[PDB]
Amino acid sequence: PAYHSSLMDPDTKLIGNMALLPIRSQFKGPAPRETKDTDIVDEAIYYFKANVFFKNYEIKNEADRTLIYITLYISECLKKLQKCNSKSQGEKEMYTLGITNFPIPGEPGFPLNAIYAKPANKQEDEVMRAYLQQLRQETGLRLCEKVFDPQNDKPSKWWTCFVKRQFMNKSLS
Amino acid sequence: IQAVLTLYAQGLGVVVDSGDGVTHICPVYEGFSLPHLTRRLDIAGRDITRYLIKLLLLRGYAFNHSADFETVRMIKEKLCYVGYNIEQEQKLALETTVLVESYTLPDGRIIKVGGERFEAPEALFQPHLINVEGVGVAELLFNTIQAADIDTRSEFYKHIVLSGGSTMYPGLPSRLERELKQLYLERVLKGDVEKLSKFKI
């Protein structure tokens, strides 16, 4: 079946019902620092092409929810990367996009409000808003030295093609 | 003994109890039975059900003996009956369509059942049909009664009582009475007497 995250620990920090998972990045955010060479953003980009085709997804950890979030986002980047002609540019479009405020668990316009808990107060709201943008950032750039072939202006059709498909028939946009 | 008890419930001959498991012809003398005469037929409901299964096969319906036993049992309970004159019954099944009846299977499919309605239960009268050696309920019943000490025959005959689910087949009482009348007219005489060879079931 679909691919599930395995970064869940018997001691993982939780932001909402999502997993506050360590993500080696230089962006600001409540993201713990990671020592293991693979983070929740790798796991997401690795499984993307396989996961996106699934319509159903059984949540097993707060870790999954983060995976599902990073995945849905990936589709958003591809929606963008489909248009542009350079890795340099793409990296910019992912900083910009990675900043736009997409709805969050609890707001209208956020698909999956029955699976994602809403922040219990104004602190979590900011923490979460800040743990998420952090992810739309890290995820946003790592997705550039993938979607672009050593010969720029070339958004590999290997990624472009998924632009019309939506994981779980859901969309952040 | 359910035999004596059965007879009791009807304020009281010979009990013919037939269920899924087995058939029993138990005589009962003025209040208490009498083992020495009791007998068994190797044909009961489960056999008739089983026999229907095979008959339905020859008709174009393949029911799995294990998986579909319960279904065929309901088919039998609802549609089967005892033919009075098998010769007569066969001409109906062969020359007309009045015996054909529809039965909806659990999966929605609708099958038609005809001649096999009276043929399956006919095992009770012709055991060999199901590869069983014997004589069949009636001819059996007859012997049991003739093999009594008389001065009871009249009572016994005049008091045959059916018991058990496998004896509810429409027409069964009539078929026994015809069979017994036949065995009597031949194996006890030969001429036209039996205007007094009375006995009800």
């Binding site: - | 009956y81 007309t96 369509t97 009045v98 429409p170 027409g171 078929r175």
Partner: protein, 166 residues
């Protein structure tokens, strides 16, 4: 010329015959059978009657308290009409179950037979059953004729197609 008079006599008789009611057997505990078939209770059977149009075409009507048997001798002018009639009556008898009023085999001496029971006259308007049997007698003759022409029509095209190629 003689057709209409014939079918008219037939219809009247069917009207008289198709007056049935439910009747449980006097012979067998809890059984119900078409008396005209089983015939085990004489008082329940009616006088058999015949309506003949000529030496070959005729109808036999056999009533009883709960069922009527209607046998028809069909017109068969020649060998070809004979085999076609025969194949056609067989075709329908094989599908007797779909008809519910068709007998599986004809009464000895006839080409096709019906067995209409009280159950039929309850599930269907009896005056329309009488209307059907008559509509049936007329339509089979038409059908046998068409088939006959159909056969002679293909026969000729087949001979000319083969012969024309030499």
């Amino acid at each position: 010329a003689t057709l209409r008079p014939y079918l008219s006599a037939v219809r009247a008789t069917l009207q008289a015959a198709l007056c049935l009611e439910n009747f449980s057997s006097q012979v067998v505990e809890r059984h119900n059978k078409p008396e005209v078939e089983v015939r085990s209770s004489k008082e329940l059977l009616l006088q058999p009657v015949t309506i003949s149009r000529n030496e070959k075409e005729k109808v036999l009507i056999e009533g009883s308290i709960n069922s009527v048997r209607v046998s028809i001798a069909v017109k068969q002018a020649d060998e070809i009409e004979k085999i076609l009639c025969h194949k056609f009556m067989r075709f329908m008898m094989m599908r007797a179950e779909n008809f519910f009023i068709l007998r599986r085999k004809p009464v000895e001496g006839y080409d096709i037979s019906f067995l209409i029971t009280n159950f039929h006259t309850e599930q269907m308007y009896k005056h329309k059953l009488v209307d059907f049997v008559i509509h049936f007698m007329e339509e089979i003759d038409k059908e046998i004729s068409e088939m006959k022409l159909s056969v002679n029509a293909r026969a000729r095209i087949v001979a000319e197609e083969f012969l024309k190629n030499f």
